[PDB]
Amino acid sequence: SQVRQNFHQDCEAGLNRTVNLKFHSSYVYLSMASYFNRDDVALSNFAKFFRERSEEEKEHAEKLIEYQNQRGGRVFLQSVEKPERDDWANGLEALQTALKLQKSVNQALLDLHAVAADKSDPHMTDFLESPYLSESVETIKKLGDHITSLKKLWSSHPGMAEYLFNKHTLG
Amino acid sequence: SQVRQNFHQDCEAGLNRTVNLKFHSSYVYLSMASYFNRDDVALSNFAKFFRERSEEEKEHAEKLIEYQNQRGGRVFLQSVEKPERDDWANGLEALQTALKLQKSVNQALLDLHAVAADKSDPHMTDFLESPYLSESVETIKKLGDHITSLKKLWSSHPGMAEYLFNKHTLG
Amino acid sequence: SQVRQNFHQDCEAGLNRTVNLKFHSSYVYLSMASYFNRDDVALSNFAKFFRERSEEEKEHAEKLIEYQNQRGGRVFLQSVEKPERDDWANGLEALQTALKLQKSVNQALLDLHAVAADKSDPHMTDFLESPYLSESVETIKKLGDHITSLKKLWSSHPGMAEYLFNKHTLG
Amino acid sequence: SQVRQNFHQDCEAGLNRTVNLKFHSSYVYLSMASYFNRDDVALSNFAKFFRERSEEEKEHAEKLIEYQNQRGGRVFLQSVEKPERDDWANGLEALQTALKLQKSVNQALLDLHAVAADKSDPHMTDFLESPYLSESVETIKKLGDHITSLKKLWSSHPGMAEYLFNKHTLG
């Protein structure tokens, strides 16, 4: 590529592997959103929350693809694996699963960053720092906060817990 | 009728029988609304919800009468039977009764549609599809959602359940 | 499901299979869009065109998932297979591939419709007719038009063809 | 300097050498702009494009001088060498020369960054990352895109190529 400069093969490959991870996360969130819209679950604000998380992960995936092209790397798309579950049990379990998902994606972004730093690519480290790394820790903090509040309500009455949280926190 | 064309006797008769069903549903909802305005029940938002359901069924009944005239059929009104109950027990029982009512009205609209299709009346099938059939499944989904949320709260404290739902969901 | 009524297993299954098809189409278009943003291809308006086609297919996939829930069916997501190619050759080949893709998706929607009609589900046939079937034939006509115009320019100079079309038709 | 802190001699020297490079680039672009305004070349939009590139490089040179002062370093200006050519042949050759120029300036910014990182100067690495390194890769991608589009048109008719590109891409 006539445009390529100081762009290592490993950074190019790590980038393609990270967009697949981002698409997989989006898919997981889509599944959660759909689960909460079920007539036998009916937690509209949980659904809404996961739907926006889904769109956000999709958006990240697309910006990474754009970054690949801007640096003169070549995009290679892989199949997107379906979510690990179709039934997400309840609002608390869904929230806890999301925290784990966010931590694994954050780790992947950290590893990619480490590769870019190792290859002396200041453009890529800068790109990954904001808003990717920033968004991750903010989302992780918010999810952690949510889990703490939902757990408190859960100890009393889980039935009432989800209803109140859906209305007062997620709404 | 100088206007009549491709309008079968069975579709004309099914139509008159369906408007009576619509008036009966409206009457049932009116009864529920009135029940929730009782000083010993006092759930203003449940009342409001059933009052609008009542007006909506009345509106459908009137549009079907108009359709009858537009096709050159003749309207024959029957007596409107009173609701099956005067006391609706509580908010959950009222909601569950409404779901059953909605399913029976939906079935009646499906049967009427089947007759129109059998008689090759594309104008009538189209008319019944939107907004009648559409409104039915939307209302059925909403009622199903409501019943799920109210049941959750009910398991903890039914007294608090109705109060909270009336305020946060129906208000 | 307390909400389910006149919803056949085959329609439920056909629906889950169609959302996967919609996600696969979106993915194919995303690949095409990314291909045209390559520095060695550089056709920004072709990219833009395929990017919106991608978002539109994604949107359809999501509305079908919502329809599934509204009818009381259960959503089952499958892995999304990657596009058949990573390099799309040129603007004309990309356009011709899209026409084939659109015809296969249209066929799938027709088959699903036929199942709904066979099972006497007027709500589903109505839902599939607009805007799904409508959007398909409009897109197919537009793509056919585009291919005809691009082919005309191609016979003279393909290099100039893509440049002019990207500017005057897609821009 | 009473203001100096954690500012290495090598970073100070690299900075003075980089502003001279920036002034030289600006001068090169000024020459290209002037060349395209010649009555026997007459490509007003190519001229305009290179004129803004010139002003942008000049602006960078000035901000680096300001950075030098802010850190307590001392500015030392050197003579600005004239461009390597006075005649730039044509629009494609001019574009290709600019890509090479941009790559060499990008490399110089990367080397300077490496020195700042080696000397543990986080203020300078941060300063160089945005908008310097960012602007470079964006300009390099845009130039690469332009060269690809112009080459396509060139294969057919170079005379028509420059005229069309000047109007549709640069205008």
Residues of chain C positioned with their CB less than 8 A from the CB of D156: 157, 159-160
**Chain C (52-71) residues lying within 8 Å, Cβ to Cβ, of chain B:** 69-71
Q: Which residues of D42-80 are buried (b: 16+ CB within 10 A; e: fewer)?
A: ebebbbbbbbebbebbbebbeebbebbeebebeeeeeee
Contact between C70 and B113 using a beta-carbon 8 Å cutoff: no
Residues of chain A positioned with their CB less than 8 A from the CB of B149: 42, 163
Please calculate the CA angle A71-A76-A80 and round it to the nearest 5 degrees: 130
Radius of gyration of chain B (CA): 18
A78 touches C at CB < 8 Å: yes
- Chain C: give the shortest CA distance to residue D147, in Å: 9
Residues of chain A positioned with their CB less than 8 A from the CB of C62: 30
Q: Which residues of C147-167 are buried (b: 16+ CB within 10 A; e: fewer)?
A: beebeebbeebbbbbbbbbbb
Q: Which residues of D126-149 are buried (b: 16+ CB within 10 A; e: fewer)?
A: ebbbeebbebbbebbbbbbbbbbb
B100 touches A at CB < 8 Å: no
Instruction: Provide CB contacts within 8 A for B171, sequence distance 6+.
Output: B45
Alpha carbon of residue A104 to chain centroid = 9
* DSSP letter, residue B169: T
Best of A31, A59, A80 to substitute, by most chain C Cβ atoms within 10 angstroms, is A80
D164 touches C at CB < 8 Å: yes
Query: Which SS3 state, helix, strand or coil, does residue D50 take?
Result: helix
Print the domain residue range for B95.
Answer: 1-171
Q: Dihedral (C-alpha) B38, B44, B45, B51: value to the nearest 10 degrees?
A: 60
Cα separation of A131 and A106, whole Å?
Answer: 12
Cα separation of C45 and C29, whole Å?
Answer: 14
| Closest-CA residue to A69 (of A108, A116, A19, A117) | A19
Cα separation of C22 and D123, whole Å?
Answer: 49
Residue C58 near residue C22, CB atoms below 8 Å = yes
Cα separation of D80 and D62, whole Å?
Answer: 14
A146 is in an annotated binding site: no
From residue C142, give the alpha-carbon distance in Å to each of C28, C58, D14. Answer: 18, 19, 57
CB-CB: which of C2, C3, C122 is closest to B133? C122
Where is chain D broken, named by the residue before each break, C–N > 2.5 Å?
Answer: none
- Residue A45, amino acid: N
Three-state secondary structure of chain C: CCCCCCCCHHHHHHHHHHHHHHHHHHHHHHHHHHHHCCCCCCCHHHHHHHHHHHHHHHHHHHHHHHHHHHCCCCCCCCCECCCCCCCCCCHHHHHHHHHHHHHHHHHHHHHHHHHHHHCCCHHHHHHHHHHHHHHHHHHHHHHHHHHHHHHHHHHHCHHHHHHHHHHHCCC
| Closest-CA residue to D143 (of A5, C46, C166) | A5
Alpha carbon of residue C144 to chain centroid = 14
On the 0-12 / 13-18 / 19+ scale of CB atoms within 10 A, C57 is buried
Q: Which residues are bridge partners to A80 per DSSP?
A: C80
Q: Which residue is associated with the tokens 């893709």? A: C101
Contact between A40 and B168 using a beta-carbon 8 Å cutoff: no
**Interface contacts (A, B; CB < 8 Å):** 34
Q: Which residues are bridge partners to C80 per DSSP?
A: A80
Q: Which residue is associated with the tokens 């694996």? A: A81
Q: Structure solved using which method? A: X-ray
Query: Which SS3 state, helix, strand or coil, does residue A80 take?
Result: strand
On the 0-12 / 13-18 / 19+ scale of CB atoms within 10 A, A134 is exposed
Instruction: Provide CB contacts within 8 A for A52, sequence distance 6+.
Output: none
Tokens for C76, please give them.
């089952």
Instruction: Provide CB contacts within 8 A for C4, sequence distance 6+.
Output: C71, C72, C73
Furthest C-alpha separation in chain B? 64
- Chain B: give the shortest CA distance to residue C160, in Å: 50
Query: Which SS3 state, helix, strand or coil, does residue A35 take?
Result: helix
Own/partner pairs, B5-9, CB within 8 angstroms, 24+ separation: B5/B72, B6/B120, B6/B121, B6/B123, B7/B71, B7/B72, B7/B73, B7/B121, B7/B124, B8/B115, B8/B119, B8/B121
Check the CA dihedral A66-A107-A31-A131 and report its sign: negative
Q: Which residue is associated with the tokens 């009648």? A: B132
Residue B99 near residue B140, CB atoms below 8 Å = yes
Count of the separate structural domains present in chain A: 1
Cα separation of D124 and A122, whole Å?
Answer: 12
**Interface contacts (B, C; CB < 8 Å):** 39
Alpha carbon of residue C135 to chain centroid = 9
- Residue C145, amino acid: D
Verify A-D touch: 3 or more CB pairs within 8 A: yes
Three-state secondary structure of B94-122: HHHHHHHHHHHHHHHHHHHHHHHHHCCCH
Contact between A126 and D134 using a beta-carbon 8 Å cutoff: yes
- Chain B: give the shortest CA distance to residue C113, in Å: 15
Cα separation of B17 and B20, whole Å?
Answer: 5
Q: Dihedral (C-alpha) A40, C61, B109, B31: value to the nearest 10 degrees?
A: 40
Tokens for C31, please give them.
């690949």
Q: Which residue of A has its CA nearest to B148?
A: A40
CATH number of the domain at A128, please.
1.20.1260.10
